């Protein structure tokens, strides 16, 4: 396999005008590696038994040498997984990368859904108040689908049997993801990568050493920022209620999931209908997938350069980004008629921008 | 990779496996060219970055102004107007 | 001595390329000049259309042997 | 596989990937036969 290693990581030729916007695929991969290493290590001392799960995490931190380091690194790195993915996806929408890298885009979307499901499974394991009540709610939005809920839990409620099986699934899915990363890379190197200017060019150079040293430089920043946040606690990435034991007969005063799920949780909150809110979920994913066939939606021949430079009409991806930020604020607020009004305003922009990306 | 009419090779030696990706993207140098490169051990490699700093910074910041900053200021303003109407709506319903 | 490259790319002159590489050497009167003459002979030379009676694949010269056996051709 | 002096092919058509193992064990039918 060493001829494959040198063909794809040493002698592979790349355009000279690459920059840091093309380095975040490597960073995501490295976050998976770090999670697998720290995750397996945590598994040696975790207990899936509901009556003792919450206690096994605390005892791990308070009694075991270096136990605090593996617990806090696993929690912090999870946040960096989703930040890197977000920047990774936004580059593609800025450069219309899916125009000719079609199966790379689709394979990526599957990886995104796999990572969402993995993170949701992991957040239930510590078995605090937010673990229990967040799983109860998010698993009810899927109630319109018949009998899709009572079986995944194996009971009449998020009981102790659900926790045992969420542990096994959480263990397994990341390694399946590693298989799909191989397909992702297959579809990319089939066509070759694009560049920031959106042109064909013969001014290319080998990956090693020029481009390999840019990936290495970015890795340093990632490791330093993870350890900075992990060891000092500068930002508030976790909710305090998950430091409280589960109580099935007392709901917390404010239920909100992790930040990387907040925006779409707000969209589903401002739509009163429960069935209409789930249809909105499918339409959004369908729109992202349809971009793989953007060449065929109009007979005019497209170009990769979108001309956002010095342009006062901006671009649709930029307008989406600010609508997402606006909704993260709404999702973190107490329900109030005024918040609901503006939340619906932003939801329209959040959805319309996706649809018009298929037009040109 | 490259188009078929560009991938055609002039030589006949076989493609070695470590070079499969190189020759999948062969491109003909239409018209020719002359290349000069100096060894990195005989160049100043930090001063050139700062020598051109002002020109590079102008180009980047000028490109991003309209498309990113102008929508950001509008979003910031909407955030303030929203928070000003929430407070007034709480007092028109609960305060006496 | 400047470490540098000067290359003329031309795809309209046949399938054969020509190249030369150089190191900084020593002057006539150097106490090490005789050894440079010898090092030149250890690397040696080779022509595909004039090997002689010793096939290149079984030459005593290691450089010739490695070049002739590359990709079995 | 077979020895080199047996693997040598008479034809020139390229070996297809689904047949890589077949031709790695080619053997000459010394003298011929009728089946």
């Amino acid at each position: 396999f060493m001829s494959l290693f040198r063909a794809h990581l040493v002698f592979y030729r790349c355009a000279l005008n690459l920059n840091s916007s093309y380095n975040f695929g490597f960073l995501v991969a490295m976050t998976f590696v770090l999670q697998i290493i720290t995750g397996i290590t945590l598994a040696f001392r975790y207990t899936s038994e509901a009556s003792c799960a919450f206690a096994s995490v605390q005892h791990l931190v308070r009694e075991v040498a270096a136990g605090w380091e593996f617990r806090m690194l696993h929690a912090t790195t999870a946040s960096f997984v989703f930040l890197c993915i977000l920047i990774h996806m936004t580059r593609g929408l800025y450069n219309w990368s899916y125009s000719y890298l079609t199966t790379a885009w689709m394979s990526g979307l599957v990886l995104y859904l796999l990572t969402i499901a993995t993170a949701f499974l992991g957040y239930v394991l510590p078995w605090g108040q937010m673990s229990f009540w967040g799983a109860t709610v998010i698993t009810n939005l899927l109630s319109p689908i018949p009998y899709l809920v009572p079986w995944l839990l194996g009971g009449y409620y998020v009981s102790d049997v659900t926790l045992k099986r969420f542990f096994v699934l959480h263990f397994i899915l990341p390694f399946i993801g590693c298989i799909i990363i191989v397909l992702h890379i297959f579809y990319l190197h089939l066509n070759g990568s694009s560049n920031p200017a959106g042109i064909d060019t013969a001014l290319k150079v080998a990956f090693y050493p020029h481009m390999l040293m840019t990936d290495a430089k970015c890795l340093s920043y990632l490791i330093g920022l993870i350890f900075l946040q992990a060891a000092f606690g500068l930002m508030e990435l976790s909710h305090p209620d998950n430091s409280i034991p589960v109580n099935r007969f007392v709901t917390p005063l404010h239920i909100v999931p992790e930040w990387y799920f907040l925006a779409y949780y707000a969209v589903l909150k401002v739509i009163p209908s429960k069935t209409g809110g789930l249809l909105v979920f499918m339409s959004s994913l369908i729109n992202l997938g349809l971009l793989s066939e953007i060449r065929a939606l109009n007979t005019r021949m497209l170009i990769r350069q979108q001309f956002m430079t010095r342009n006062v009409v901006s671009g649709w991806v930029i307008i989406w980004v600010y609508s997402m930020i606006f909704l993260i604020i709404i999702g973190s607020a107490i329900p109030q008629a005024t918040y609901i009004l503006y939340g619906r305003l932003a939801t329209i922009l959040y959805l319309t921008t996706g649809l018009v990306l298929c037009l040109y | 990779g490259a188009p078929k009419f560009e991938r055609k090779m002039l030589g006949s030696y076989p493609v070695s496996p470590e070079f499969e990706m190189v020759w999948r993207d062969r491109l003909t140098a239409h018209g020719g060219y002359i290349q000069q490169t100096i060894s990195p051990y005989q160049l100043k490699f930090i001063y050139p970055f700062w020598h051109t700093f002002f020109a590079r910074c102008w180009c980047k910041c000028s490109a991003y102004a309209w498309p990113w900053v102008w929508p950001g200021l509008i979003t910031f303003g909407l955030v303030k107007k929203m928070n000003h109407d929430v407070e007034e709506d709480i007092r028109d319903h609960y305060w006496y | 001595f400047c470490g540098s490259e000067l290359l003329h790319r031309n795809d309209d002159m046949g399938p054969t390329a020509h190249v030369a590489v150089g190191f900084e050497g020593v002057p006539w009167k150097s106490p090490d000049a005789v050894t440079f003459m010898l090092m030149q002979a250890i690397v040696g030379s080779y022509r595909k259309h004039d090997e002689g009676i010793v096939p290149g694949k079984v030459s005593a010269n290691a450089t010739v042997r490695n070049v002739c056996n590359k990709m079995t051709v | 596989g077979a020895p080199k002096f047996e693997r040598k092919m008479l034809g020139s058509y390229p070996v297809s990937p689904e047949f890589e193992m077949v031709w790695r064990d080619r053997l000459t039918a010394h003298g011929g036969y009728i089946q």
């Binding site: 060493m2 | 496996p17 499969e20 | 079995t72 | 693997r7 390229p14 070996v15």
Partner: peptide, 18 residues
Amino acid sequence: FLVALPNLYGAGGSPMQA
């Protein structure tokens, strides 16, 4: 083994047809 799988794309080839 460390020189297994020579190519990812294409139709491969035989060393006896070089």
